[PDB]
């Protein structure tokens, strides 16, 4: 959006249809970097100690939340005129940073709030239900105030409480039940993020290199629900609720233009 670098589609990995009907579910990642990068002299510039904020949601233009939660979805995988269907357990977002020049990925590390004691931690894959991306100033409020997204005014904006949904209207095969927890986020929020240079390399490292932030929308599928372990599509491992090996299969991916980290040495 106006704020932060723009995002472009990298690739759509595979269709996702509603199970009962076979109809295509429209998917669109809605990302925005609300702090950390701005343009100066034709360049998107960030700085070492100015940790950035990246947020994202995803939307289903052709399906409301209610319906979305009551339906079932499969990934359409095709290999040699042979189409298979993998059942979706839930949807989630993952972020990654890359060396825009040589595909090599660079680590992303988050820092806990200033007043909040706590060591740095790795960004998480975030289970999400369809939602519009709140505007910059709302995201800002969230980032600067503890538990504000949990107040009555913002709760419905940032969460879907499964334990508050009227079950009886849902089928036993509804997507809502296959999600990891009752508290499901509507917005994937990664605040106070920094690019972490490899510990194998010395300083400086980020200087003069172009980086790119990637936002990945995926569907976690259970290898036990199909024959074999190969979905036939790019994916990352992700333990399921019962610690069973699950599979974050890629659906859509987006990235920012080249990003530069500036400072002094």
Curated annotation (Swiss-Prot):
Transmembrane segments: none
Known outcome of mutating residue 140 to A: No effect on DNA-binding but strongly reduces progress through meiosis and sporulation
Gene Ontology biological process: cell division; meiotic cell cycle; positive regulation of transcription by RNA polymerase II; sporulation
Intracellular or extracellular location(s): Nucleus
Effect seen on changing residue 115 to A: Reduces DNA-binding by 96% and abolishes sporulation
Phenotype when changing residue 49 to A: Reduces DNA-binding by 95% and abolishes sporulation
Sites annotated Interaction with DNA: 49, 115, 146, 192, 264
Main subcellular localisation: nucleus
Key words of the record: Cell cycle, Cell division, DNA-binding, Meiosis, Nucleus, Phosphoprotein, Transcription, Transcription regulation
GO CC field: nuclear chromosome
Modification note: Phosphorylated by pachytene checkpoint kinase IME2, but also phosphorylated in an IME2-independent manner. Phosphorylation probably eliminates SUM1-mediated repression and is also required for full transcriptional activation activity. Phosphorylation of the DNA-binding domain by IME2 does not alter DNA binding affinity.
Its biological purpose: Transcription factor required for successful completion of meiosis and spore formation. Gets activated after completion of meiotic recombination at the end of prophase I. Recognizes and binds to the middle sporulation element (MSE) 5'-C[AG]CAAA[AT]-3' in the promoter region of stage-specific genes that are required for progression through meiosis and sporulation. Competes for binding to MSE with the transcriptional repressor SUM1, which represses middle sporulation-specific genes during mitosis and early sporulation.
Subunit and interaction comment: Binds to DNA as a monomer.
Name of the molecule in the record: Meiosis-specific transcription factor NDT80
Organism expressing this protein natively: Saccharomyces cerevisiae (strain ATCC 204508 / S288c) (Baker's yeast)
Residues of the full protein shown: 63 to 327 of 627
